[PDB]
């Protein structure tokens, strides 16, 4: 079968270039750790408005001042 | 006694057929192509990623107003 990938590429190298780009396209999102950053960037882009909550017992975290060390880690993008 | 053909001075010109100048072929091409194309996508992810950062700043000025 190892000649079939070289004796049709002497006759029609047209669709062979298509399968070579059809392949190596489905394969790569299962490979590089650059993906799931593509979902991590896409999650912390605020469209709507952040409504606040109310104190009742808890008090889990995040007081009235926003610039306190209160919220989660989305500040790795400015270092990126 | 005034007739044409010279005693000497001739060529001739060829009957030949040749201009096969190569040409940068045969794994030299398909190597400058991919090496150029990967420089393109490497020049992406430094602009398209950076524009998404300024994008959030554009939404930022919206949210700090509208109460
Ligand atoms: C089939 C596996 C697909 C997934 C492979 C994963 C990637 C692998 C990387 C490429 C490996 C080599 C691929 C083998 C190609 C063998 C096909 C072949 O020889 O063609 C025979 C025959 C050739 O018969 P033919 O004699 O008439 O040749 C005419 C070919 N043209 C038209 C180009 C002049 O081709 C076919 O039967 C299929 C043609 C339809 C192809 C539709 C393209 C799909 C578009 C992208 C999706």
Q: How do the SSEs of chain A run, as a string of H and E?
A: HH
Distance between the termini of chain B: 117 Å
Strand content of chain B: under 5%
DSSP summary, beta strand count of chain A: 0
Overall, the morphology of chain B is rod-shaped
Overall strand count of chain B: 0
Helical amount of chain B? 40-55%
Structural class of chain B: mainly alpha
What's the topology here?
This is part of a larger assembly, with chains A (about 80 residues) and B (about 70 residues).
Chain A: H1 15-22, H2 38-41
Chain B: H1 32-43, H2 48-64
1,2-diacyl-SN-glycero-3-phosphocholine (PC1) binds near residues 8, 16, 20 and 22 of chain A.
PDB class: oxidoreductase
Keywords: respiratory, electron transport, oxidoreductase
Entry title: Activity optimized supercomplex state3
Question: How would you describe this protein?
Answer:
This is part of a larger assembly, with chains A (80 residues) and B (67 residues). Chain A has 80 residues and is mainly alpha-helical. Helix content of chain A is 15%, strand content 0%. With 67 residues, chain B is mostly helical. In chain B, 0% of the residues are buried. Classes of the chains: A mainly alpha (80), B mainly alpha (67). 1,2-diacyl-SN-glycero-3-phosphocholine binds next to helix 1 of chain A.
Features:
part of a larger assembly, 2 chains, B: about 70 residues, mainly alpha, 2 helices, about 45% helix
Summarize the structure.
This is part of a larger assembly, with chains A (80 residues) and B (67 residues). By secondary structure, chain A is mostly helical.
């Amino acid at each position: 079968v190892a000649a079939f990938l070289k004796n049709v590429w002497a006759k029609e190298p047209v669709l062979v270039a298509s399968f070579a780009i059809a392949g190596l396209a489905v394969i790569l999102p299962t490979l590089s750790p650059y993906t799931k950053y593509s979902l991590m960037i896409n999650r912390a882009t605020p469209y709507n408005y952040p409504v606040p909550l109310r104190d009742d017992g808890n008090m889990p975290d995040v007081p009235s001042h926003p610039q306190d060390p209160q919220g989660p880690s989305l500040e790795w993008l400015k270092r990126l | 006694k005034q007739d044409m053909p010279p005693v000497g001075g001739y060529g001739p010109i060829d009957y030949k057929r040749n201009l096969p100048r190569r040409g940068l072929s045969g794994y030299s091409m398909f190597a400058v192509g991919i090496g150029a194309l990967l420089f393109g996508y490497w020049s992406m992810m430094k602009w398209n990623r950076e524009r998404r950062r300024l994008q959030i700043e554009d939404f930022e000025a919206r949210i700090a107003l509208m109460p």
